[PDB]
Design brief:
Two copies of one chain form a homodimer. Helices cover 24% and strands 28% of the residues of chain A. The longest helix of chain A has 12 residues, at 123-134. The first copy, chain A, has two domains: 1-108, Beta Polymerase, domain 2; 109-177, 2-Layer Sandwich (Beta Polymerase, domain 3), CATH 3.30.210.10. Chain A is globular. Chain A is α+β, with helices and mostly antiparallel strands. The chains hardly touch. The structure holds lead (II) ion (PB). Chain A binds a DNA duplex through strand 9, helix 3, helix 4 and strand 11. It is classed as transferase/dna.
Chain lengths: 177, 175
Amino acid sequence: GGSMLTLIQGKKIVNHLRSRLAFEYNGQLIKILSKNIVAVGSLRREEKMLNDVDLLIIVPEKKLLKHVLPNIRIKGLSFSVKVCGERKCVLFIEWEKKTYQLDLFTALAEEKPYAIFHFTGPVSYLIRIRAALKKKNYKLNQYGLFKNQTLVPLKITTEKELIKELGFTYRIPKKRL
Amino acid sequence: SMLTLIQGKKIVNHLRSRLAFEYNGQLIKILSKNIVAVGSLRREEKMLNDVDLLIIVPEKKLLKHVLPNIRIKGLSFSVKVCGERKCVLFIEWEKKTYQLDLFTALAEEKPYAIFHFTGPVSYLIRIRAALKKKNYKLNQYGLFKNQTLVPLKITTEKELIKELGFTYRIPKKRL
DNA sequence: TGTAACGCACTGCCAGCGGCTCGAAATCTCTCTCGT
DNA sequence: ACGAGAGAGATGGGTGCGTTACA
Ligand SMILES: [Pb+2]
């Protein structure tokens, strides 16, 4: 399944999910705040046609990771799980008698700029940036910036601040290539 | 069982020199200056329900041995529960069963510990809720702000309370 | 460029010392009740 | 307000490869 989408339909879906996300933690069903849900992937890059829908869920405490995605719940929508772990969670939802693919990702609070930057993409862009930092003996991934296997502590909070710090010119998501 | 404050102080006075614990073969005595009486007794309450003492343990490694291997000279006591921090005993005093609670704290936790175990509950609740509104957390181990232990330049319970921004009151006047 | 989830082979190491299984033994989290 | 002890409940080899998949 997982047919194509229009950017408009994708944006419709994101807004539909903004309030209908929760997860089974012990006894309770804990709501996921809209302020901890970020739309990434092709949708954030304002692409005309989407192949899937990508959301990034900001998990506050590190211990919560093993429960959030494995026990993810959406109010009033039929979704089948293809695969699922603590970091990735590919679902198969039904939207107005259409089968679309939904991807869920997780990131802690301190890794959020690296995550947004990673999951915004596209791949070709990331390859450009990462190979550049690789040549200066660094490694960049969705968790943080590393140098000689050491996490480099950057005094940043936003994706924009991260990009400035890596020595690159900020480009809007739709213009990154 | 029940007690009077005078009976309670007498029992405390008896134990100040008769406290020890089995540490890997060696029986180490507990110093009287490291033994603090807390609870309803320190608040000079008329009638007691139990006796509460606080044992000041010097090294962090020692905590796991003191209470679980507690020793009192020449008295028959059955243990209800016990850990490294809590130790509810049931002693025999003149063929009578009274309840004894033992608590432990390290040297740097001593003012925070005394303050916690002095109580009463209602008093602790006012103080803690007040500091919580200012983005702090206070417990029997220390003062915290944003999950970071706030180092206070204090040494005594009074010094702690003044530093926390509260008017000092003797234990029987705390509510 | 960099990482995830997953089924699997090959052990390695124990509950089982032979079997790769079900679930033992021991260790975790959660919860309930307690303390001031 | 905040934390400890005990007993209930749940886990269920460790590694590392190859494949498929995510940006
Ligand atoms: Pb085995």
